[model samples]
Target chain A: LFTLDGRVDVPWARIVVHDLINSNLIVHVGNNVRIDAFGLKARLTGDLNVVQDKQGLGLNGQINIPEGRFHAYGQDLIVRKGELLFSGPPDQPYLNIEAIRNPDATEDDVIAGVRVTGLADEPKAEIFSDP
Target chain B: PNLFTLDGRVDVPWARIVVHDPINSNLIVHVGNNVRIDAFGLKARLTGDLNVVQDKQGLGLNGQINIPEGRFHAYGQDLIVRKGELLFSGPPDQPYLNIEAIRNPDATEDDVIAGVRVTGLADEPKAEIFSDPAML
Candidate 1:
């Protein structure tokens, strides 16, 4: 239940994911906190559980998502795919989601579906069609 | 170090392939219409009636692929790349081969991509990652 306005950069050399596999870190985000990135502001909501699975250590949880509108990348984004699962196989690691763009806009508005997959260190980012 | 950009269609077979559930993500194959590969060799299959639809207004493109089974000619070797992306999707038990090479290979490693024989099951086969300057 805290409000944060800044950048928290973690250098690659200092990041240790495999070692913290046993630590089941639970992060709760309330509706008050807003994260402004790429000229877009969105509130963080829900519980994020960081755990260690067979595919090394990663994260998997639900972020309720911030209500209202978030403007970024010359488009408006609203919570569409509130479910975030950060765990996957070693070959194809995944961070999958489909967030609506230009939320206030009509259904004809374009959508932005983001994903992070492939191998570790060099994981791939993919966005494809709906259905 | 030479940058590679390869773009083409690959014939993917469905009959002799394996399906794994624990790889990652959904079985989505949405690709860009003008998809271009600025990378290296790929001996895998691109199954199903894959389609690539270009995003309007010059926006970036992305998609998912569920590779059941495939193989390459390079077996019993090391595969490394300076910067690359490999997306694998299949059953956990099933396996595949990975070919690798350094961003910059020595003179001896040049012109060495030919006559490379891979021995093993298709699932666990290997490939040579050395670059062939003569071929490139």
Candidate 2:
């Protein structure tokens, strides 16, 4: 069992772990940390646990994104609600995020947005508009 | 899994991609403020917004990339790119190319300026050269 508590700043980083058996790791991000990758740049805070048990390598915890911007469709959308819940595989974390375009960036009153859900690896996106 | 849709913008800060094409030639591209095409013998900066969409069929891109400036090297001479554009309609892999390159005015004192215009699909491009003072 291992525990980590501090602030992490990841400008550009990648981690890969292989061939592991029977181990538990815990992490607690108490302060705001910046993460930039996969067209998503934002500051986040959260708690997570990496457990390797009968179910194999699994992750359990929650990460909260308070503020950030996602680049898509040739536009930068502001993040409204961002949450990552890890209940099973580390790569298949549950995602619930919504990003909308800035009112000033559009010409009309109708605001366009995108919502992301499902697992991280195989996520789903939806386009919506509001006036 | 009924209908999957993706809509958003992608900003490529910097990337180096290499494609292996034995039939034609190896293609190397660098994306950033400038896009370098080693196989095509040209270097141009591309700026624009691109939108990506994904459906049950596949993924596609829409938008236009503007080349405000760059250079094209041909026949041991460098031609300045005056205007360029890559228009993407739906295909993710192919974009229409419309570009014009002019020889450096300072390179020659002759009363004629030579230029080249490139237009057509990226994969099957056609280039034509013309002179300012019609050579009759």
Candidate 3:
């Protein structure tokens, strides 16, 4: 469900990391804006200051891959703020996701039957960031 | 005619629900139910049901859903829930979400997006019972 002309290319969108119902990592941005994962990379060089969910998005928010396999969705999760910061690590990379509700559901249920729940679990990145 | 239903105006147009946690990627757009979710270029035009859970905060859909000039960021610890009418910004995407149509002179496929299969469904996936008033 992606479309935003002037596209940042989304760093090669195709990030499917749902670390078990909620451990985190179900990013699906393939072919653009990629930082080439190892630990972390950032963008939105400006307009960054979005903080909603004052307390209402149900369940738990996730995206923390602390496993060894060197997952791409690695390096701390949880985002909020306007974006725009082209050029990445090796050069560029970034992905995305959205939710509404199951009125019938056809695809992208989180990326074809994902239920790894931490495949090797360790500490590649993301551990409750706030610093 | 129930293309996920988007009939609002703007300014947090009563936000039924929308959760977009974009950093790397992951999508769930099912409004008209074509199931659209493209990654890397970050394009989220979703419609419903993406509440991943286990622990990070719980209710059902996850948290941190900013309104007006929208900013949905929650990678991992999954949680998302939208009812209708939500928008975002790009080179031309800037409004977050706005809709206002009693019904519509339209019904051909104005907007439709979809893509799926990323329900690691392991976290506290489902935990709704009511439990209150001294245990009911």
Candidate 4:
């Protein structure tokens, strides 16, 4: 329910655990969540991850992109599909997701594919383009 | 800042930009004030105008797919409907199209995008339904 108003330094902000709903404890970023790593300097949107681990509060769930897109090469790499899954401890979670070139892509456009995987703390986003 | 004359605005502090240098770069965009762009990454003030420019073909969100409920009923289910930018880009007469049906977990397993087609006039439009490869 929190909306990011501007740039947020994710490393500095503390994640808060809200109420436990229907048995699943919710872990969401407060409105000011921001990241300085992407150099994207762009305003971004992300869905919160609900804690699913039995041990306690953990960033274990999925970030679904129902309607979001990224501009790349010449097309809006519409996150038309994919999910950012977070599993493991809250401090160090594993992230895995694939953001491929949008539908109106050509064979060459495949090179514009994107792969995001690894630790949520140091997640790697590989832009597989001719650049 | 390298200021130069463009379509309409020039030396204008904050105006959208477009560059089409296919060999060296694929895209160059301007999102907003104090914001810059390249093939990727954008930085700008959160407040202000969100501008865009298209110097070449096949750029930005310029396609859509829409079908209302009850219009499509099949497979013992009321066919779902969705609309947005066109996925595949080719000729206007025959550009491939793909969209996900909300009911599936594995996108690959979903038959939505498989062999989707667009025909007829761009304004009026025509589309083919997704047929299961396995069933075929």
Candidate 5:
């Protein structure tokens, strides 16, 4: 039984993480954290239970992304809605996100954007233009 | 040497890498625009998806790297790469090459387009020059 209690504040960093096979490590997100990678940059806050046991590694928690941007199709889409729900497999977290090109523009009534949903590894993205 | 086995998939949507000589400026390579690289000795803007894997044999790659447009420096001239491809089956060090490059048309006045075709392994590549409209 291990507890991780602290605030992880990272200004700018890059990391490559892999799954833990067989071990006894438990991680709990106590505060907000920031992460920047390849095509996504965001600040996330959540309550998560990351554990590795005899039944392999499992993730159970919810991560709320309040601010972020995703790059796609040569444009940076602002993240208007983002949430990551982990309910089992550590590699596959449920994703609910919507990123738009211009969310605060008064000129154009209709805007183009991308919506991502489903597993983290196998996410489904839909391009849409909405008012 | 450490021995370990790996089993998973790595998805690379976009990446950028710049390799330059700090002292001499002899070599400079810029990899970006949805392109990924495995090895060296070639300059190209490739577009494709690849998977890096490791097993009992060794590290390997699986997929294809396509070149939409690029420039290759060879034989005292910068050849314009019209079409190119690097097909990877297993070995990480070796990928089959199928590339075609043409000489600058503005360099000559004749109605001839000289080009080269590169094929075979990346380490042991084979290049052959040919002319359009069949040079007799």
Candidate 6:
């Protein structure tokens, strides 16, 4: 149950997601927000949800909102139990998408970043320090 | 850190294909007469094929790849520049990328390039950054 949203749909009534397993979360207010890097200006609106399964033992399901903007929303995000490492079985760590931006001159463009609201009891993301 | 600057031009060939999608933006891959993929590093000079495609909205380049030899192998699923100096892993971090090299033979294969360290951070005062305007 991992989600990364860059869109917002509703205003005033905020969307909140909780990591049922570890219970972690983050909140962002939609509207006109300014990101300090690369001069990115845009609006936000969208809904994305990632919740645990019936037992809430670990991550089970996810809702994809690829093009949704989140002005003020929240959704539980968790990733655990599998052959998957942060980036893969091994090798590259989960590099922040925050550092990766599409500067294409294309019309459809927006501030792109991956924000993981929360994780299970154990940290969902692991970072390695050895080359 | 080293600054890299790679430059080149490619002429992609033009060809016709069939498609039917009403979306304002259609995911189309048309053939081009000239195309280019350039990269600059510790090495110099590497160019690929050029297949060109153009239409009303804009122009797109297809059937081009990073040339090979001089240094850093650029052939296959993933490009290994100056010994993997800069890379875009196909399967994320597996180092294995699903690449299609439009070179000599049009056969698609896994071009494995082992990554190696080229240099280490040695100089300190030599470093420079765009200090805040106020710092000026």
Q: Model 2, A1-131: lDDT tens per residue?
A: 22212222222222111222344545555453555555577877787776666567877899888888776446768899999999968878899999898655644443488899998988999999665
- Quantify all predictions' global Cα lDDT against the true fold: 0.36, 0.63, 0.24, 0.37, 0.61, 0.26
Q: What stretches of model 3 exceed 4 Å from their correct place?
A: A1-36, A39-50, A53-62, A66-131, B1-28, B32-136
Tell me the TM-score of each prediction against the true structure. Answer: 0.26, 0.42, 0.16, 0.24, 0.41, 0.16
* TM, chain A, every candidate: 0.41, 0.70, 0.17, 0.38, 0.67, 0.19
Write candidate 5's Cα lDDT for B78-109 as tens digits: 67778888888878679999988887554567
TM-score of chain B of 3: 0.20
Second chain TM-score for model 5: 0.66
lDDT of 1 by residue, A1-131 (tens): 11111111111111011211123344454335444334434555555554543456555555443443545445555555433444533233333344555546554545555444434456566654555
Best by TM-score: 2
Cα lDDT of model 6 by residue, B20-89, tens digit: 1201111222223322222332232323333233335444433323323324344332323332122222
lDDT per residue for candidate 2 within B32-95, as digits (tens), equals 3633333266666666766655544566677788888788768777788888999988796889
lDDT of 1 by residue, B1-136 (tens): 2222212232222111222221111112332222222112333333233323222222222333333333332344333332222333333323233323332245464435432333233466664433442323
As a whole number from 0 to 100, the lDDT of residue A109 in candidate 2 is 42
C-alpha lDDT (0 to 100) for residue A24 of candidate 6: 16
Error of 2 at A31 (Å): 16
Residue lDDT tens for model 3, B10-60: 111111221234122223222222223334322244433332222223122
Count backbone overlaps in model 6.
Answer: 46
Ranking by TM-score: 2, 5, 1, 4, 6, 3
lDDT of 6 at A51: 28
For residue A128, give model 6's deviation from the true position in Å: 86
**What is the model-wide C-alpha lDDT for candidate 4?**
0.37
Q: On residues A82-128, what C-alpha lDDT tens digit does candidate 3 reach at each position?
A: 22222212122122221122223333321211122222222122223
Chain B structural similarity as TM-score, candidate 4: 0.22
lDDT of 6: 0.26
The alpha-carbon RMSD over the true interface for every model, in angstroms, is 21.9, 17.5, 16.8, 21.3, 16.3, 22.4
Summarize candidate 4's per-residue lDDT along A3-64 as a digit string, tens digits.
11112112112122222211232333333332222111122235344443345655555554
Greater-TM-score candidate between 5 and 6:
5
